[PDB]
Every structure is written in structure tokens, then in C-alpha cells.
Point group: D2
Chain length 250, copies 4
Amino acid sequence: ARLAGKVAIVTGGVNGIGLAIANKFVEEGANVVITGSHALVGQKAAASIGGVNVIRFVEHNASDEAGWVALFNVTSAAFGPVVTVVDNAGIAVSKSTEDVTTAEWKSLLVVNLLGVFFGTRNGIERMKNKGLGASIINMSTIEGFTGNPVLGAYLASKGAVRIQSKSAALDSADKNYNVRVDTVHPGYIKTPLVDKAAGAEESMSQRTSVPMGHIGTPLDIAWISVYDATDESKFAVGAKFVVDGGYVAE
Amino acid sequence: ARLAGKVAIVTGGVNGIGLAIANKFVEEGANVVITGSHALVGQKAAASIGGVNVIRFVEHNASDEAGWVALFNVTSAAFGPVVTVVDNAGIAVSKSTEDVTTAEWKSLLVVNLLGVFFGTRNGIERMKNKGLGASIINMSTIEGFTGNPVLGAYLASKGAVRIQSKSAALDSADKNYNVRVDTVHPGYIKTPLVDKAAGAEESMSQRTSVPMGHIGTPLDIAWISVYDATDESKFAVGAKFVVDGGYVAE
Amino acid sequence: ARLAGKVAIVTGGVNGIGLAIANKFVEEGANVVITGSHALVGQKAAASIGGVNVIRFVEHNASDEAGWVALFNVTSAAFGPVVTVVDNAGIAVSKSTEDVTTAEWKSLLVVNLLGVFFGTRNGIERMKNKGLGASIINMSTIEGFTGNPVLGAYLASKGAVRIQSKSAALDSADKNYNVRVDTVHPGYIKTPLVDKAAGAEESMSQRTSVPMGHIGTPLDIAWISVYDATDESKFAVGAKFVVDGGYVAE
Amino acid sequence: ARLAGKVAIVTGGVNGIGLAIANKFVEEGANVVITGSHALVGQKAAASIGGVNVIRFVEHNASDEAGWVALFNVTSAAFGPVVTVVDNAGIAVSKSTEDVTTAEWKSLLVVNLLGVFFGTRNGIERMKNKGLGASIINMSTIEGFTGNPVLGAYLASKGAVRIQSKSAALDSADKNYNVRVDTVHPGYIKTPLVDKAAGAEESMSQRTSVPMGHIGTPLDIAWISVYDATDESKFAVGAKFVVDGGYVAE
């Protein structure tokens, strides 16, 4: 019951970290809408967690600005006023800054940065001043703190989310909106996508990368997001929550 | 049951933040030893939370190096192997660096820095390699991130705890000790000590200090410490967890 | 002679910080191209510093991707191979995240983020592997470290520049390109634009904003950029250089 | 002439980084006192740079509190009022937190932390309110930002110097003392001590440690310290200046 009465939107909620967030949110009493681009993936994901009284899928691309107000409307029609937004949808491009095409740059930033902007802006407007204990959780990354030579556009996007979220936190705090905004910074997490890239988990598990010598699992990110969605974290805003196996500590 | 089977030492556990940590640790199933300098304060504190099957007081000054191994022995005799150490004992001096006497400097660092060192070193030695899911939670502060012109020695101590904790985290991770080390960074928290200082809460609540316009409460720190003591945070090590009402975000 | 033989592009070099960078670069022996949107402003600016053997103006919008390779060509035709790129062009929008229009968001990011990307990508390609001691200096801000509730899009842009620059630094270092990339983070700086906003300098000079009690001047940013362009800083890459009167230290 | 009229104390100025700071300070017009523990090393060091009109050695242990006021007196008798203090003396212990003896802990902190405190406190008292453009440069390290599992006490000391320096910066700024305080954070630097440790330079030069693939040289730290001692950096206070070959950027 740590999220009793909460109503959450989790973007990119049909896979990996987003799916585990959705799963533990439902376990703790939240009602959840998960979004993703692919209907078969999303419908399967939602039903794996529960029935439509607690979780529903909505097909939505986080870069689709017009779809964001309709996503809030669909969620509110199902479950009542939204209290919690998890901006987790994202894509990755394996290119250095030098090698990034302008098309790749714009495509990644449209999801990773504009999508987080759209969800954060709308979340503040739709959740402020309602006594909801509202919480916006923006998914950055260890790549919001440190560079990676082969993730130039992804670093830009995660650095932007990191500091934009502080602006939003501050405005919400100063205006007594009853909205908190924080960032979560996963390290490497094992998912079916990582499993599809031969050698990725072993590269990520080297001690010079992750000092724990292994990578995490989606629930590792789900539990910090439960804390941040809950009223337990009512004094936490504008902060960065790193769950990375020690990556950024060295 | 989030701390089912855990056995915690909370230094400075008889007042304020430490007491609330102890309270919520017991609520989540931990057995707890709280320390403090003053027997009447400590005995009252322990009994306010529960009986001696779940919480006991031990009189101990965290600067007392010889008492630290005996504190572990007393805790283990009561409750079995220690899994969780919260290094929360600390003192404050209201002096600029310019105005700090060497006596004040040494007194504060003996508790705030040497005491955390003693608890962290001993905690690693006594908890490693036992499959306990062990966790060391070192209390830094917002004063581990930003200066305050009137808290020079306190800033030194909190900066030291911040980075020493990363060293310990890394060594524990690299050696597969099954010990995590993290820091918690409270902002301003309302306690009876703050209530005794006329005008302190209002100063701390100005928007140029805490953007939320009010200060926190001890449970705000207790709940992040429950997360960090629990196996929910098994991939979090070497990281800084800030709960400050937005103080450091501007 | 600290920049003997260097050839620099300074975007947004016709006003304020960029102009002072250009001025001190010429003083230290560099040849400089300054860019800006407005021909009369740019021509006056260039001639205020020196003749066309040491400084020239090129009209260019940093968001104009096709103009960037022509800007390098014009600079190289004048002065020989470019060694130094200062990505300083930028705009500001005074809006919270909540109040930012999508048009404002896209307009600011096209200059502040895409323009820095275009200059950094091209700079690496055109300066690598030539033994030039090449240096890319990306202008972030104190708003790359801390939020401001009324600068949401500007914070996003400066956070992105901060971390994208680390990616570029690392790739250049790992590949032995002989290119360094660093960020400069000015605090508040007095310029004619600040002088045009009634009350801005006094707001910025309050001790709760800038602890020095006054704001800086353009040369304060020029001298850190001379250090970073010079071979004196040959071991500095991927780092953040803050010149802010103490703003971020509290 | 970048340090025309400055009078500097450089602790640990007889070797390595401190010696190079002293050398470039003299080159830029400063008068310098270098300290060290060993008379033959110090006398040779001073004469290698210049005669006693510009540089003198004083034998002093930075942990020797009573010697610090006499060191200022000796410097002022030689050269007039001190303007610049570089707190560079330090020692290292290769131990994890777990393996650090209390004797090792106290010995290292007495030099690395108490010595910096003594020089910073005295520097503020002796240089404030004199129109000197005074500057205190505290030597932290990359180990003030990130942990190293084998440098536990050294990390504590460098984290403490990092944040204590911000307190001092702020107090000096707020009181209009005309004293700035900043930290410098070297990465790995080649010195005769590093050359005496078989395999150290190669370990430090691995790309997973220093992305540039080599370590720095003492002059790399000297030139950032010239910038910080000079009036060029009159708006820089409370900040961290990292010169590390990219170490902390990944």
C-alpha cells in the first residue's frame, strides 16, 4: 500500500525498466497506464501484471506532442486524476559526437529530451494544486553524469533531462504546486535488449565499468521509483538518485 | 517486512533523525541498537519505540574507538550478526573557517569524521563475506555538497564522509564483500534542537534556502534509510541520496 | 604570445562574453573569426579589436548547419587551419518549464544545443590529427549545474552541452586526436543586454544569488578561455570551469 | 608579469607539483616562499628557480600549527604582505578504509586536512581587507571527486578540502574580504616519486584510468595555479578546477 490511491503514467512501460516500474507500482497499490509504440508488446505487458482495473496499455510515442494531452485524458477517464508521471521512454544511438548524423541527433532528442519536456510540462499543468502528492520521475542515466565516447547524442539528452528537471522542481516548490520532480540515473541493467547484443553484459560487468562486477535488473530501478512516487519522499525534489553498481563512484 | 532479518546499529539514534531511522527500521522488521551519550535520553528513546526484543540503547560516543568493537559485540549478543550500520552521530559548531579554534576543529572532526571512519571500517570487517546483504549508511548533509560560511569544520567533515564512503563502497564492490556503502544528505529537518534555536526554522524555510518554503521532518530521512538498508537497493553503492526540499537544486 | 599561432572561431563573438574572448585571444596572438547574426554589430565589433590580419567578422547563425562548413572554410582561407572553436552563441527565454511554448523550446535548443553540436562535431572532424593543440570550448553556464525556475529550456540546453562535451572530450582523448573539449560556466556577467533589463544587475548581485555581491565582467570569462585555448591546458579535457562569484558554491 | 606584485607561500613547494607552481609563479613576477620538511631538498629547489630576492625556502611541516604564523612572518619580512597561499603539502597512504590503521588515518589527516585548515584560516586572517587581490589555492585531487578503493584516508582528506574551501570562499565573498578560495584537482602527474614506484605510470596511463593514455606533468598544475593566483580570476571563488586528462569525465 506504499502507493495507495496513486495514478501513474509510465512511458516506455512495456519493456525492461519501465515494465518493472509498472509492476511494482501496481504491487504497491497504484493504478498505472503504460505506453509504448507497439500494440502486441504493450497488450502482453499490461496483462502480465494485472487486469484493467489496475493497469492499461496506451499506444503512444513520447515524441508525439498532440498525443500527450489525450494520454492524460485516457488515464484520468480510467482511473481518476493522474498523480505520478514516469518519463522513461527513450532510444539510444551508438555514435560518437563526431560520427552522429543530424538525423540521428534529432531523432534521439525528439524522444529523450522533447518527450520528457512534454510529459513534465503537462504533468505540472495537470497535477498542480490538487493535493495529490504528485511526483514526476524523469529517467536520466549514468550518462547524465559522465560521458561515454560512443553515446554523444544520448549524453546530451540525459544531461538536459538532469538539469531541466531541477528547473521544474524549483518552480513547483516555489509556487507550492504540490508536485515534486526528481531524476533517476540507472547504470547498466540486464534486459532482453542487452541480452540480444552479444558481449554487452560482459563489457558492462568489467570492474572498470561496474565495480560490483555484474549489471543490475529492472526491479533495481523499480524500487527507487516506488520511493519517489510515494509520500515517503515528500521532502525530496530537484535531486538525482543513482542506482549503478558503483559506476559513477570511481 | 522490508527489513526482515536485518540487525542495525544507528549511532546518535536517541534524538531527531537517528531516532526516526530507528523507529521505521523497527516498523519494517529490523532489530536495532541505538547509541547516544546520555543514558536517560537513550533509555526513554528505546522504550518509546519498542521492547528489548527489537530495540536496545547502548551508551557510546562515536569518537570512542575502543567502544566500537564492544558495541558490535553487544548488538550481536542481543540480535545476532549485524547487517546494517547507520553512522548518524554528529555535532555542529557555528563558526566560519576563519573563526574556528583548533579545539573546536578537532572536537567536531573526532565525532563527525573519525566516528564515521570507525563505524565504516569496523562494519566492513564484521559484515563482509557473510551473505547478509549488509549496508553502511553514512550521514553526510547538504553541507557535504555546498559550503556554508558559518559551518567551516562541519563542511570539512561532511565532504570527507561523502568521498571516503565512495572509497569504501568501491573496495567492498570490487572484493565481492556483500557490503554496500552510501551517503544520505539531509537538508534542514525540524527537531527539538532546531525548535530551541529562536528563528532557526524560519531562516531555514526562506525560499532562498529551502525552495519548498518549509523544512523537513525526521521521517523524511528515515524512509530513504529504509530503502538503503533493504535488499531493494542491492545495486546502489557509492551514491549520494539527497532529501533537502530543493536546497541544493538552486 | 600565450596563443601564438592559434586560429579561433568564436560564435556569438560580436557582443559581451564572446567579444571579450575575441579581444583577449587577439591580445595573446591568436587570429580570430567572430560570428553573429547582425552585420553592423559584427563589423563594428571586429574593427574595435583590430584589422583583418588578426580578426574578421562572418555573419552566421549557429543553428545554420550548412553555414558551419563554409565558416570553417572562410576562416582557413583567411588564417590557415582552425585550432580553436568557442561555441558561445546562445539565446535565452524567461519561461518556466510549465510556461514554455514548444516554439520557444525548439528555437532555443536549435541555437544553444544544436549549434554547439554542429560546432563540436565539425571542430573534431576539421582539427583532429594535425598536431595543432586543438581546443573546443563550449559555453555552458551556472545553469548547466543548478536549476532556475524561470529558465527551463535554457537549463535543458546547458545541461546537454555540459555532458555532451564530456563525450566529445573522451572520444578525442581515447583516439589521440590532439583535440581537447571543455566547458566554461559563467555566472552573471554585466553586459549592455543586462544593463537594458531594469533591476537585473541588482537582482543578480544579491548575496543569496552571487555571494561576491556584484556580477562579473566579460573579461572574467575571456581569461579562462585563454587558458583553455592555450597549450598551458594540454592535460585539461572533459572538465567544467566555473567563474561565477560563488553562485554555485552555496 | 601575470603575478606582478604577488607574494606567495607554496607548501610542499620543494618537489613535484609544488615546485612547478613555485617556478611559474616566479616566472610571472611573484615572490615565493616554498616549504618542505627537508632542508637539503628545499635549499636545492629554491636555488634551481632563482635567488633570494624572488624565492626562499622555509623548513616547515604543514601539520605544525605554531610554525604557520612564523612562516607568514618570515615571508612578510622577506617580501612584504602575503597575497597568495597554495596549500599543496600532502602525504598518501595506500590502504583501503578497511585496512587503515588509526595511526595512518590521523597522520595523513594531520597534514592533508589540518594543514590546509591552518593555512586557509591564517591566510584569511592575514590577507583580508588589504586590497591585495588575495587568493588561497587548496590542492585537492581527482580523489576529492571519486573514490579509490586503496586510498580511503586520502579520499577523506581531499573531500574535506573540497567542501571546506567552499565555506571559506563564501565567508570571504560575503564579508568583502578581497580573498578568493578555490580548489585544484590534479589527476595523475609524473614526478620522481611516481618514477620510483615500478609500474605506477603505466597503471595510471591505461585508458580506463586516464583517457588521454598518459599522465600529466607538474607544469600542467602550475599554469592553472597561475590563473587562480592572478587578478585574471577575480570572479572565480568557491570553484573546483580539474586538470586530469579526462579521468573524472568517464
